[PDB]
Amino acid sequence: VEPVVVIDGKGHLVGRLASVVAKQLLNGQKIVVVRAEELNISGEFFRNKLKYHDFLRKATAFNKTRGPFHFRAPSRIFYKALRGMVSHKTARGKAALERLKVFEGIPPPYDKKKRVVVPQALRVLRLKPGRKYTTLGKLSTSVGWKYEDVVAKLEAKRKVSSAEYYAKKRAFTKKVASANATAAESDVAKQLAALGY
Amino acid sequence: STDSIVKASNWRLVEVGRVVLIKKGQSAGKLAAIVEIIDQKKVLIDGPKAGVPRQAINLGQVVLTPLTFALPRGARTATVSKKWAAAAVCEKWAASSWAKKIAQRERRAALTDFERFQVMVLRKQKRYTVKKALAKA
Amino acid sequence: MAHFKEYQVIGRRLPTESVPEPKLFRMRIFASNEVIAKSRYWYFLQKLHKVKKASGEIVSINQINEAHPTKVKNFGVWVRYDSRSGTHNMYKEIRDVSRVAAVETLYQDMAARHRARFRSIHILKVAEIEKTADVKRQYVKQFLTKDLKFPLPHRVQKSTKTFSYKRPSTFY
Amino acid sequence: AESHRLYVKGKHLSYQRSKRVNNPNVSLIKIEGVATPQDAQFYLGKRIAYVYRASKEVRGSKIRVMWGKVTRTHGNSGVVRATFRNNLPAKTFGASVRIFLYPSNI
Amino acid sequence: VLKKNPLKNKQVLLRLNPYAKVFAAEKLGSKKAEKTGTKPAAVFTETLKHD
Amino acid sequence: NTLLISGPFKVNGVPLRRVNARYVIATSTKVSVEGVNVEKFNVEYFAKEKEIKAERVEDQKVVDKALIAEIKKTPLLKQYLSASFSLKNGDKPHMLKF
RNA sequence: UUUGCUCCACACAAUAUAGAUGGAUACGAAUAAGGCGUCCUUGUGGCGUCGCUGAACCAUAGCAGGCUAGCAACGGUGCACUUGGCGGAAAGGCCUUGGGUGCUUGCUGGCGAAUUGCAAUGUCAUUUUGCGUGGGGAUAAAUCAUUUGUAUACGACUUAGA
RNA sequence: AGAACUGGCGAUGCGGGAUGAACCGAACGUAGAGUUAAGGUGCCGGAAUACACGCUCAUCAGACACCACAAAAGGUGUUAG
RNA sequence: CUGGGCCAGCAUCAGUUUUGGUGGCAGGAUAAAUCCAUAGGAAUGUAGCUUGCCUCGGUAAGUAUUAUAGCCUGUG
Ligand SMILES: [Mg+2]
Ligand SMILES: [Mg+2]
Ligand SMILES: [Mg+2]
Ligand SMILES: [Mg+2]
Ligand SMILES: [Mg+2]
Ligand SMILES: [Mg+2]
Ligand SMILES: [Mg+2]
Ligand SMILES: [Mg+2]
Ligand SMILES: [Mg+2]
Ligand SMILES: [Mg+2]
Ligand SMILES: [Mg+2]
Ligand SMILES: [Mg+2]
Ligand SMILES: [Mg+2]
Ligand SMILES: [Mg+2]
Ligand SMILES: [Mg+2]
Ligand SMILES: [Mg+2]
Ligand SMILES: [Mg+2]
Ligand SMILES: [Mg+2]
Ligand SMILES: [Mg+2]
Ligand SMILES: [Mg+2]
Ligand SMILES: [Mg+2]
Ligand SMILES: [Mg+2]
Ligand SMILES: [Mg+2]
Ligand SMILES: [Mg+2]
Ligand SMILES: [Mg+2]
């Protein structure tokens, strides 16, 4: 129902966004997730830092290379939650996951593309108020992610541009209004109104 | 401007006479009026004009509208009716863009294929003169 | 245990030699159907008198509908209930529009707060509180003020579709 | 006419299956726009078609079609069941499928 | 060779038990009771609404 | 069991033709058909005896001229009748009207 | 080495495809608050308005969309051109100038459709890879062997030789 | 380690309990359509991110019979009594 | 080139089934309510009244049970 679906990762809860994203792929939907750094996890920071550190302390004892890999950046923290919900060792699964793309900050193509939200994974809608939660970027930087600063830099810089863009656009529709009026209550106007339009 | 400025957040209140849009069920889409408060999540509503039977309702399955009128707590249906009429509630309702959007929504849903076709031909005609206007100023 | 109903259950010991026509007893019973109602009659009747149903009969079952089902009222509820370590008496208030409603939430409450399942709870007495400010428990009393009104902050509209093209608002 | 389409767009989700044993004989289908058993009743009986390509051209065309029909509803969420003349490939899980308006009863 | 059910297939319904013919014809799957006026004694309803 | 159909031909290329009832969405809209003969057409009429008869081509014109007469009465019925039906994006047939 | 070699147009035989079939339609942010409009002290400001879903918006008529005559615009859109700019997060895209040109369903005409016989089976999308035309374009190294010992079990490494 | 009655395993696959002799459900000719059981329906995974009232925030929360343990003792956490 | 063989669509049926729409009856406190009538009555006390305060708009207490809102209980 859209060739590709860009999701603004922001304000979403990992596991729930993960669960919805993962079923989309299995059904043939191409999903690309942006701004993973501004993604949430229920529970206060210290907790989820504690958790990640438990993930951290596991590794093939005889060869730390073989053992579980500990990706740190948000996009891949999220890819983990996601992959855990796909049958990723099967052909089908590998295919599913190849319909997915996960970035931190929103980086070209999609810079100018519309992103959406997933209400049923929207932290604000979801978490009870007062309940402590975690921002994924802070967690990541905390366990080794190197690039929060840079993403912040590039993101701000982009938000600048995107503003002048929207401001232009918000003004174009001003112009579209000036000429909307002249026709707004013309005759076909009242006529289209008859049929719900 | 040296005043104390406090953004006074302005909620729809659950109160006697607060009128509500019923969301789900046998009386879905109809307007009722809150008559008395049961508890923090339950109320006693009644919508005589709309044909919604006086009942306890779960505040969940009803949406509070901004419309509120004058009604004495616990009023029986009969006077609930008398006051709603007096209040010109229905009138105010149908005047809201909330109401009209519902009806537009309703109208499109009703269009027959041929009708639908015409809407296109007229949308086409109105766009011509609009793109025109647009390209002039 | 479902949608509750109240039943007048009337029964008597079976008739005999010495007592042609024995004394009729009645209970009000909140059960969800007749078969349970009559069984819960015989449960108590074993514990109060020493009748077994084998030697008795059920003279009538009648459903006691609520008188004024669309009049909000404040019920007082007296409960005997069993816990993991003892058995206790309670009193609580429930504001509702009918007796049968009151009981449902009583039974839910006993179950949420004290983990008491239906079996571990006798309903002693349920009675409308005629004079307001005979209302004893605050969680009801705070609904009894003049010109009561409250808001319902942070409203979470359930979405139909899975993606939405606007960041939602919680603004009731 | 930018559009030419007279079918409703659909996905091929799965075979009928338990937790650990599948049934290739029935196929579960997700019909775009349909969200409830109530709704999905409308498309019962209708003709499904999976359309695929191939190298070895047969009928002058290198396009082939697997036909079958919607047979009953599934679950609570507009999902629906289908038998095809020959069970669908299974590589097709997540592929698009076509749900037609005939046999029409409108 | 094939058990036909009488609750569908009116024919085999009619083979077993006729009267169905008159039953249907005379409605009486409906049919109203005749009204009466028996009102319950005061003691009856005192006890209903008792305690 | 089939439905005699006509278009009309001059309106959108469709002939007086047979079509199965189960492959047609009957719409809500309707044109009067009182003044149209429609008697001579039957099974045998269509019975395949490449090269179209001069009868068929004539009958078409007879039937059509009346229909196009009645069609033209109402605005855009003719133009509608010429345009082809197709499901647009997010048409939900299972509750569209027609 | 004797085939050459690379780049732009469309051309032909194979080849493959996790699955086109009107449009992936760009603020940021808050959610016990905000969007849009409008004014101003340009701000924790004034007034108005909106939500209760994208059930939107845009596009959608024409042999799978033919041929043909005009009217009213001077708009729309597509294709190659052209004037400026902007984009490095993977910018490989965006805005803009001036014409040209196909179409234009904003509107009014003149034709065409059948017999594909009552559904099957009827738009063809893009990957590669070989050859083919003609146009532009470029005219190298690597390995073996030999040699150094900053290297070395063998390969490998590091040097050197017209 | 050793008896009692019954039901099992052994000799028996099948659906459930991830896993598994013995639990739950249910016993088996080749198949079609339907309905179920025990058990489940965020995603892995077929099936409501269903409805409703409460309770709970754990810098060691918790999450389902058999079953993969926890006690005496204590808390001005919080809820009801 | 028709007839076979096979495959398919539609129609009318039979057997098994699943999912809707709609018609007529029965029972109960011959549902309970609403509604109507009447009796009584209270407060989260409607109107008036009294009273300081007042921007003379109205306010706050006191009185007063329908009045310039209404509600509750019984009976019919
Ligand atoms: Mg979370
Ligand atoms: Mg982790
Ligand atoms: Mg380590
Ligand atoms: Mg597996
Ligand atoms: Mg940038
Ligand atoms: Mg005990
Ligand atoms: Mg007990
Ligand atoms: Mg299945
Ligand atoms: Mg478009
Ligand atoms: Mg505002
Ligand atoms: Mg829009
Ligand atoms: Mg034309
Ligand atoms: Mg034409
Ligand atoms: Mg053609
Ligand atoms: Mg002209
Ligand atoms: Mg030309
Ligand atoms: Mg077909
Ligand atoms: Mg040496
Ligand atoms: Mg046993
Ligand atoms: Mg042995
Ligand atoms: Mg066994
Ligand atoms: Mg286990
Ligand atoms: Mg047992
Ligand atoms: Mg898994
Ligand atoms: Mg599922």
Ligand SMILES: [Mg+2]
């Ligand atoms: Mg804490």
Ligand SMILES: [Mg+2]
């Ligand atoms: Mg136990």
Ligand SMILES: [Mg+2]
């Ligand atoms: Mg305690």
Ligand SMILES: [Mg+2]
């Ligand atoms: Mg032949």
Ligand SMILES: [Mg+2]
């Ligand atoms: Mg049948």
Ligand SMILES: [Mg+2]
């Ligand atoms: Mg009255």
